Amino acid sequence: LFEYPESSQAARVVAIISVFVILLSIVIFCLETLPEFDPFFLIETLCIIWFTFELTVRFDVMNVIDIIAIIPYFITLSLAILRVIRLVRVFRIFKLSRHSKGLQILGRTLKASMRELGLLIFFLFIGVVLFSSAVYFAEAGSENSFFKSIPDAFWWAVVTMTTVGYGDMTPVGVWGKIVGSLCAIAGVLTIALPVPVIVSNFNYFYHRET
Amino acid sequence: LFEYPESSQAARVVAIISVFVILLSIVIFCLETLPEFDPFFLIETLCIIWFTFELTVRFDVMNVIDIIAIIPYFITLSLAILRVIRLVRVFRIFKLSRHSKGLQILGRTLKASMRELGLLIFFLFIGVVLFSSAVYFAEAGSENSFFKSIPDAFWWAVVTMTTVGYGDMTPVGVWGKIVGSLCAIAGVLTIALPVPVIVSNFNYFYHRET
Amino acid sequence: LFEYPESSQAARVVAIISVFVILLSIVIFCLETLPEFDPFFLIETLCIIWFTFELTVRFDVMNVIDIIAIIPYFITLSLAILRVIRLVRVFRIFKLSRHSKGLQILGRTLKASMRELGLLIFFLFIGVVLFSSAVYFAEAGSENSFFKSIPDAFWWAVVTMTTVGYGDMTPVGVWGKIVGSLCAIAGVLTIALPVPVIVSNFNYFYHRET
Amino acid sequence: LFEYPESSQAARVVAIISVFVILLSIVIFCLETLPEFDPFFLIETLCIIWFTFELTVRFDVMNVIDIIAIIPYFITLSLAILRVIRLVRVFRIFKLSRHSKGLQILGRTLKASMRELGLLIFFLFIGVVLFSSAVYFAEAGSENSFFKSIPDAFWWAVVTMTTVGYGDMTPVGVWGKIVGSLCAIAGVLTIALPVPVIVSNFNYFYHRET
Amino acid sequence: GTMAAVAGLYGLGED
Ligand SMILES: [K+]
Ligand SMILES: [K+]
C-alpha cells in the first residue's frame, strides 16, 4: 500500500486525522498539567497507538521526530530525569512539520543558516558578559547592591539587550543606568545584524516553495 | 442622488460630515464608558440615524461594515451576549476605511497575505507551547513554583516572544531564566521572518496607489 | 560680515563657539531643574545674549527656531502658561540643526514623508481604540476590574502595541490576556509597515548629501 | 617561530589552546565575583602567564587588546580606580576576535560605520533630552511628582525610546502618558532610521569574507 | 520585528 505520503482523495482524510490526533495530544498535554486534574491517560494512550501505527506504516529527521514523540511513553512503563522525559514529551508538536508546508521552510532556513545563528548567539554572549560585568562593577560600591554578582546580572543583560525589559529597575545608581542605556543600544544593534541573512534564507526557501 | 460614492462636485461637504459623525460616534463610545457617566444616547441615536440614512441611500465588505456599524444599536431595542454586542459596537471605527485611502491599502495588504498571517500565528503558537512547557517543567521542582501550569505560562511566553516584557520576574530559578533567554531570542527570530513579506505587500500596494 | 553661513577659518571658530553655547544652555536647563538648586540665570542671560547677537547678525524654518530659542527668556521679563513657556525653552536644542549636517537630513526626511507619518499615527489610533475597547469589555465582568474605562486602557494599548510593556499585568482574566497577545502581534504588524518608506527616503537624502 | 599565525596542523592545537584559555579566564572572572567565594588566583596566574607568553611570541589594534588583557593583572602586583581596573579586566573577552572570523567582521563594520553610529547616538541624545523635559514639565503640577527633575527622567526616556520598558508607570497623569506614547513612537522611528546602513555594511563585510 | 528589527533587504521592496 504505502499510500500515506501521497495526498489522494482517500489519503487527505488520513492527513486530517493525523493532524487532529497531534493537536489532541498537545491539548491533552497542556490540560493534564493543570491543577484541577486516568481519563487523560486513555486519550494519551490512543494517541501514542495511532503514532506507533503510522510509524509502522512508514517502517530522515522527520522519522527521528516520529520516534521521539513515542519514546517518553514507553520510558514511563533521580526525579530530574523524570521531569526531563515529561518535558521531552512536548516534541510531539514537531510532527506538524510532516503536514505543514511552511514549517519545513523554517527547518530548511535553520539548516541553511547555522553559521548566522551561531554568530548571533556569539554576539549575545559577548554583550551579556560585557554589560553584566560593567553593571555589576558600577553597582559594587553602593550599599545593598542590586546585583550580588556578575552571573546574577546575566538575566538583566539578556532582557535589556533583547528589549524585553527587566521590570523594576529603580534601586540603581547613575552608573548602572548609564550602562543599561548602553546595553539597550548595543543589544538592539547586535540583534539587528545577523538577522537579515536568516530572513533572506527564509524568503528564498519560501519563494522556492511557490 | 448617488452623490456619496464620488467625492466630487462639492460632495466633499458630505464626506467631511461623514468623517465627523464617525469620529463623534467613536468619542461618544469612549466617553459613555467613563465612570463619571441620557444625552449620550441622544448623540448616539443621531449618529445611528445618519449611518442608517447613508446606508439606505447607498443601497462588498464595505457594505457589510456599514451594516455591522448599525446592527448593535437596533439589537438593544446571558449578560455575556450584552457585553459582546457592546464590544461589537466598536466596529464603527472601520467606517473610516471608505474615506481613508490608506486604510484600504491596509485591507488589500491583509487580504493579499493571509498565508503570511497564518504562518506567523502558527510560529507563535509553536513557540508559545514549546517555551511554556519548558519554563513550567524547569519551575516544577521549586517550592512555591511561579507557574502553576503550562497554560498559566502562555501569557509569559507571549510577552517574552514579542519582547513586550512580563514585568516582575524574580521568583524564578536559573533554568527558567535560561528558558526565558532562549524564548526572547526565538521570538525575535520567529517574528522577524514572515513580517517582511507583509511589508513588501504593503509597500507594493502603496506604490500602486500613487 | 555674514561669515556665519559660509564657514571658513575665523568663521569656523564662531561655529564651534555657537555649538558650545548651545550645549551649555541645554546643560543649564537640565541643571536648573535639579532639586539642589541666580548663577544659573546669569549663564542663561549670557547664552541668550549670544543667541540674540547671532540672530541680529542674521538679519526659513531655521530662523523660526532661532526666534523660538529666545522668545521664552523675553517673555519672562494661569500657572500652566508659565509651565508651557518653561517647556518650550527646550527648543534651543534644535539650534544644533544649523551645525549638524545629519539633523537637516532628518528634517528633510520628516518633511518628505509626512503622509507616511500620518498613516502610522492613524494605524496607531485605530489599533489603540480597538484593543482598548476589547480589553475593557473583556475585563468588565470581573470583580475589581483592572480597567475603570476604555480611555483608562489607552496607555496599556499604547505600551503593548509598541511593545514597551505595561509592567505588572497579573490581575487580568484569560480574555484580557488573549486580547493582549493579539494587541502585541498587531502592534508588531502596524508600526512595521509605514517605517520602510521613511527609511528609503531617509537613506536617499543621507547618501545624496554624502 | 611565528607558528601562531598560520593554519598548520600544529597551529590548530595552539589555536584551540588559546581559545580554551580565554574561555577559562572569562569563567574564572565570572565565578570569582560570586558571593560563595587563592585557587582562583592560581588559574588567573596561569591564564596571564599564557597570555604574556603568546604576546612575547607575537612580538595594530589586536596587539593593543593583547596588552590590555594582561595590564590589569600586573597593575595589582581611591578605591574607584581599583573598581575600574577590575572592570577593565573584562577585556580578555576581546582576545577571541583573533580566532573568530565573524568578530573581525563586526569590528570592520564598526570602524567603517562610525558616522551613522554617531548620528544614532545623537538622535538618542536629542530625543532623550526632549522627551525627558516634556514628561517632567507635564508631571510638575501633580503633588508628589514621579520625576524629581529632568535628569531623573533620562532613564525613563531611554527605556521608552528603546522600548525596553520602565516598569510600573501608574503614578502619572494623562499628559505624562501622552508624552510617553509620543516618546515610544519617536524612539522606534529614531532607532530604525540609521540601522539599515550598518546592517548593509555588516552584510558587505560578511560576503566579502565569504 | 519588534526590536528584532528586520533591515528590509527585500530588494528595498522593489520600489
Ligand atoms: K521591545
Ligand atoms: K519591552
Author numbering:
A (entry chain D), B (entry chain B), C (entry chain A), D (entry chain C): 216 to 252, 277 to 298, 310 to 327, 357 to 489
E (entry chain G): 1 to 15
What does the original paper state about this entry?
Here we investigate the mechanism of fast inactivation in the Shaker Kv channel using cryo-electron microscopy, mass spectrometry and electrophysiology. We resolved structures of a fully inactivated state in which the non-polar end of the N terminus plugs the internal pore in an extended conformation. The N-terminal methionine is deleted, leaving an alanine that is acetylated and interacts with a pore-lining isoleucine residue where RNA editing regulates fast inactivation. Opening of the internal activation gate is required for fast inactivation because it enables the plug domain to block the pore and repositions gate residues to interact with and stabilize that domain.
To mitigate proteolysis of the N terminus, we expressed a construct containing mVenus and the affinity purification tag on the N terminus, enabling us to purify the protein with at least one N terminus intact within individual tetramers. Subsequent removal of the N-terminal mVenus tag using TEV protease leaves two additional (Gly and Thr) residues on the N terminus, which we confirmed with mass spectrometry. The kinetics for the onset of inactivation in the GT Shaker Kv channel were slower than the WT full-length channel expressed following RNA injection, whereas recovery from inactivation at negative membrane voltages was faster than the WT channel, suggesting that the two additional residues do not interfere with inactivation but probably destabilize the inactivated state. To capture the inactivated state of GT Shaker, we reconstituted the protein into nanodiscs and were able to obtain randomly oriented particles for cryo-EM imaging. We therefore used a cylindrical mask covering an asymmetric region of the protein to initially obtain a low-resolution map containing an L-shaped density in the region of interest and then used an L-shape mask during further 3D classification to obtain three classes (A–C) that contained additional density within the pore or chamber. In each of these cryo-EM maps, the voltage-sensing domains are activated and the internal S6 gate open. In class A resolved to 2.94 Å, the additional density fully plugs the internal pore in an extended conformation; in class B, the additional density is positioned at the internal end of the pore; and in class C, the additional density begins to enter the internal pore. We tentatively conclude that class A corresponds to a fully inactivated state in GT Shaker because the non-polar region of the N terminus inserts deeply into the internal pore with the N-terminal Met (now at position 3) interacting directly with I470. Density corresponding to the additional two residues present in this construct is visible within class A, curling towards the intracellular end of the pore to form an inverted J shape.
